[PDB]
């Protein structure tokens, strides 16, 4: 029933959410590829349907954010009938597949949304 689950994985493409106060909040598309080092994110890549879920952990994100990113990843996978492959992505050590989703490459920014804790 979570609105963003209802949107997940319907069309080929790239969906990015940021953990914000224990919720999954869409990232504005103009910011795709820039990642706040203070935050954690969930990324669903859909291919025409194949699913790859990556959860990206900034070096300064708080424990509530990285934990929620892990749990939301599991919940999204279950919503997709277990069909997604899950990938943990740590800032600066991301997989070549994850980096490959962004034409301009991965970049990082200082700051982030406040911890829910």
């Amino acid at each position: 029933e979570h609105p963003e689950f209802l949107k997940a994985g319907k069309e080929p493409g790239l969906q990015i959410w940021r953990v914000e106060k224990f919720d999954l909040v869409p990232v504005p598309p103009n910011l795709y590829g820039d990642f706040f080092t203070g935050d954690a994110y969930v990324i669903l890549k859909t291919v025409q349907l194949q699913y790859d879920l990556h959860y990206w952990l900034g070096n300064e994100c708080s424990q509530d954010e990285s934990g929620a990113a892990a749990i939301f990843t599991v919940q999204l996978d279950d919503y997709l009938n277990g069909r997604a492959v899950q990938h943990r992505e740590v800032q600066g050590f991301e997989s070549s597949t994850f980096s490959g989703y962004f034409k301009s490459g991965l970049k990082y920014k200082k700051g982030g949304v406040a911890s829910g804790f």
């Binding site: 224990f22 919720d23 954690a40 424990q63 892990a70």
Partner: protein
């Protein structure tokens, strides 16, 4: 409404409110009843003279439901001051807890405490989530039980969960024993709490046990002191690392059981070969008995020796791992999706 998070520990209950970064209530999992009503936790220890004291969840499995219900009533009313009938509750359970035990706890929560919604979580899964992972093997060593729990893509692999046959209480008892070499005679329940504090304050895990025995004998550098409640000072030497060495060599306790390194290895081997790399690369420590200085480096050496040399061994020792079960529960129960995960009392009562 804000959920309540209750980690039913073999030695101490951790309890609090969803969204906090640590439990606000930590108290011993003990019930005291008159020798010739019931007291729980610290109150029961203060009155050990006039009470018979019992552990209802000695090894992580509830064995006395009347006493366990007293612990839960103490949690809600004396510790949290929360009406259980007005909050969702997340309760933790041990790995491999029988379904009939989960069903009895659920019955007590819905029918005695009238909780409006409940979710039961596996302790080690919560710890893994608190580390920011969906795949790994958790080595949870608490007071009366330890387990190794492989988890893949969010879910424990039940056929691979192992029990390590000792825990923190066994270590306190072993320190009590070996301190007789120096002439100490700690034996009462109250002295045991002293020795537990000595263990937590002074013990450490040797990187190489045999080498540490050799180097420790060559000087008094090993000796460290502790002030007893009566102001006397005790000095401890090689007992500092011989005590937690029993996690690796249970034969020190007269047990035939495998040590925590061997157990972790066996646990990973139960999982299919195509996922072992991700387990070896995400060995996550949790629980109070993983708090010893030196544990991560020793465990890395020992598991690396046992494991195929193509594997990449990574032991993760989060600083707040003593409470990582409870923290993982606090995160999960704070999520915007938690309301879809729980069971309501109305559903249960009509099931």
């Amino acid at each position: 409404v804000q959920a309540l998070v209750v980690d039913n520990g073999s030695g101490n209950v951790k309890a609090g409110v969803a969204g906090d970064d640590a439990p606000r209530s930590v108290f011993p999992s003990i019930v005291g009843r008159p020798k010739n009503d019931a007291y729980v936790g610290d109150e029961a220890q203060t009155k050990r003279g006039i009470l018979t004291l019992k552990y209802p969840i000695e090894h992580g499995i509830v064995t006395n439901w009347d006493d366990m219900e007293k612990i839960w009533h103490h949690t809600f009313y004396n510790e949290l001051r929360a009406a259980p009938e007005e909050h969702p509750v997340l309760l933790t359970e041990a790995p491999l807890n029988p379904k009939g035990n989960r069903e009895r706890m659920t019955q007590i929560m819905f029918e005695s405490f009238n909780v409006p919604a409940m979710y039961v979580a596996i302790q080690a899964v919560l710890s893994l989530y608190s580390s920011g992972r969906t795949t790994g093997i958790v080595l949870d060593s608490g007071d009366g039980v330890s387990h190794t729990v492989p988890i893949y893509e969010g879910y424990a692999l039940p056929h691979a969960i192992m029990r390590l046959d000792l825990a923190g209480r066994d270590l306190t008892e072993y320190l009590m024993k070996i301190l007789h070499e120096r002439g100490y005679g700690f034996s009462t329940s109250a002295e045991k709490e002293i020795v537990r504090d000595i263990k937590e304050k002074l013990c450490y895990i040797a990187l190489n046990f045999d080498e540490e025995m050799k180097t420790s004998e060559q000087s008094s550098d090993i000796e460290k002191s502790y002030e007893l409640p009566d102001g006397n000072i005790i000095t401890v030497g090689n007992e500092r690392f011989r005590c937690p060495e029993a996690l690796f060599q249970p034969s020190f306790l007269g047990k035939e059981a495998a040590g925590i390194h061997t157990t972790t290895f066996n646990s990973i081997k139960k999982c299919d070969v195509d996922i072992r790399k991700d387990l070896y690369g995400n060995i996550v420590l949790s629980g109070g008995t993983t708090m010893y200085e030196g544990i991560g480096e020793r465990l890395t050496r020992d598991i690396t020796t046992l494991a195929p040399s193509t594997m990449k061994i990574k032991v993760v020792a989060p600083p707040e791992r003593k409470y990582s079960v409870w923290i993982g529960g606090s995160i999960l129960s704070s999520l915007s999706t938690f309301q879809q995960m729980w069971i309501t009392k109305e559903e249960y009562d009509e099931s």
